[PDB]
Amino acid sequence: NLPTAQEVQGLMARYIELVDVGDIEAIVQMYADDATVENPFGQPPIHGREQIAAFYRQGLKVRACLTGPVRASHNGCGAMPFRVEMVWNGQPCALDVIDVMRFDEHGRIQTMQAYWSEVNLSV
Amino acid sequence: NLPTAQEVQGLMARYIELVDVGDIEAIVQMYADDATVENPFGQPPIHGREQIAAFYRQGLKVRACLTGPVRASHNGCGAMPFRVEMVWNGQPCALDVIDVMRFDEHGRIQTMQAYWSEVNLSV
């Protein structure tokens, strides 16, 4: 059901583990079927698992690690800071991001907002 | 005006500096006159500078430190992770928090959501 705060901490940590290994189908399964993603926040959202899978397939050697604890609420939401390390035109880079997620009553991500901009990239 | 991503980084960093010294009047001035604060996110919002002042006066020796970079967007919003250290019944404790802010056209905080729960407290 709709995650408690402990359950949100666990779900968001699992998300980062899935991004880190790059398991696109497992990441997509964490989302509700009609979830929305705004990544970076400020951009038009993407809707549904097909579009979300496309987004992660395009983005995802990548590593992702939490860079602080998950902050969870008592209403099925949480926020976390992390860093993604990737290769862009042969150049290692890193991006610092904070995601905010809202989970539904089945423990699936209903909405995701990713906060970052070019200021958060390190080449 | 409405802050660029660089300006959001600067404003949110300034907010932490003001919380760290405990300058309640300077903090309240960062908010729009009719701003809303949800802290912790999940609790009913408070509205307006008078209630926001009361909130900070009650919450605020306290220290506050960013524990990673500000993540700013291009639509006048940002998110940041930080830690607040305080004394509760003579016991030092720390709270890990992520705040999301939305700034208005004058560079004032229109809405603040603070993410954390008891899971983020260390006594």
Swiss-Prot record, chains A, B:
It is an enzyme of class 5 (isomerase). Keywords: Isomerase, Lipid metabolism, Steroid metabolism. Induction: By steroids. It comes from the Bacteria. This is Steroid Delta-isomerase. Homodimer. One of its GO terms (molecular function) is steroid Delta-isomerase activity. Substrate binds at D99. Changing L121A: Slightly reduces activity and reduces protein stability. InterPro entries: Ketosteroid_isomerase (IPR039256), NTF2-like_dom_sf (IPR032710), SnoaL-like (IPR037401). The active site is at Y15 (proton donor), N39 (proton acceptor). Its EC number is 5.3.3.1. Changing Y15F: Reduces activity 2000-fold. Reduces activity 10000-fold. It catalyses: a 3-oxo-Delta(5)-steroid = a 3-oxo-Delta(4)-steroid. One of its GO terms (biological process) is steroid metabolic process.
